[model samples]
Target: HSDLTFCEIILMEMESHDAAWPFLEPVNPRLVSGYRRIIKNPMDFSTMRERLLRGGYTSSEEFAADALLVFDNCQTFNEDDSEVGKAGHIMRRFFESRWEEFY
Candidate 1:
């Protein structure tokens, strides 16, 4: 299992969104605030998936793809100690392993 703490996971999730917000802003004006609001509180994968759907994401596949892109962009910073980077690494590994299942 991963060693990331709960708070660290939350930070990673938020930072991933922060990194991707600019790219996503023009795609859907409502997404930025909706993403921010959902991440503000404790949430699970299903909850996030539901919220994304409500916020106009067409499916889990789309959200996963977009989320992976966000994490990928964050990896560009490549700070080993950064929580965002760590989270991106974690997410990248997971998504890559499950690539066929997601898409």
Candidate 2:
């Protein structure tokens, strides 16, 4: 079976946003690097699924739902100096807006 776990799917979705937002590219170098590293060598779905289950995500549906929740929460950027937060806000919005294409 080529089924992908929810965590794996989320990571892939995150990778797709690596260059989607040019304005925030320089603002969030670490986030970009993190995405690049994960995209280069993604975690196995089985291991990710196991970790999600241990985190109380009993089903793939639940896992996906929680991932969306995290994405939603990441959008609350109000700091003027926190570039990471700004980057997160942009990335999360990018992912959430384009989530239908992936899910």
Candidate 3:
């Protein structure tokens, strides 16, 4: 019943982007093994959307923090040259460029 905010719009693009597919959901702690230990703070597009839609974020920057954290976790968990890492890199670029326009 209301217009989507700029933050939501940006998240929609990030969630829909081809490169962002890998970050759509959380990492599987069981299969990945040690991921939960290494990545104490996990982030993903789905969870981010939940937070935004549920009014969990205090501001654009708050959302932005988790947004970037997704890629940061990717860079650490996956090999830099692997498929997931590459996707993270591309998505990071896309997100950064889009986030540059506003706060």
> Candidate 1 on 1-103: residue-level lDDT in tens?
1222322343345446433233322223264344443332222344444455356554445545555555555555346567756755665665455454423
Q: Which ten contiguous residues of candidate 1 have the minimum total lDDT? A: 1-10
TM-score of 1: 0.38
Task: Evaluate all candidate structures by whole-model CA lDDT and list the values in order.
Answer: 0.45, 0.46, 0.86
- C-alpha RMSD (angstroms) for model 1: 11.6
lDDT of 2: 0.46
Task: Kindly list the per-residue Cα lDDT of model 3 for residues 18-81, writing each as its tens digit.
Answer: 8877889988899888898889899999999888889887777788889889999999889989
> After superposition, which runs of candidate 2 have C-alpha atoms over 4 Å from their true positions?
1-7, 13-50, 53-56, 76-81
> What are the per-residue Cα lDDT tens digits for candidate 2 across 1-103?
1123535666555645553332321224365444443332232234334565466455556555644444333333224236645655666566566555656
User: What value does the lDDT take at residue 75 in candidate 3?
Assistant: 92
Model 2 residue pairs with clashes: none
What is candidate 1's CA lDDT for residue 13?
A: 52
What lDDT score goes with residue 89 in model 1? 69
lDDT of 2 at 6: 39
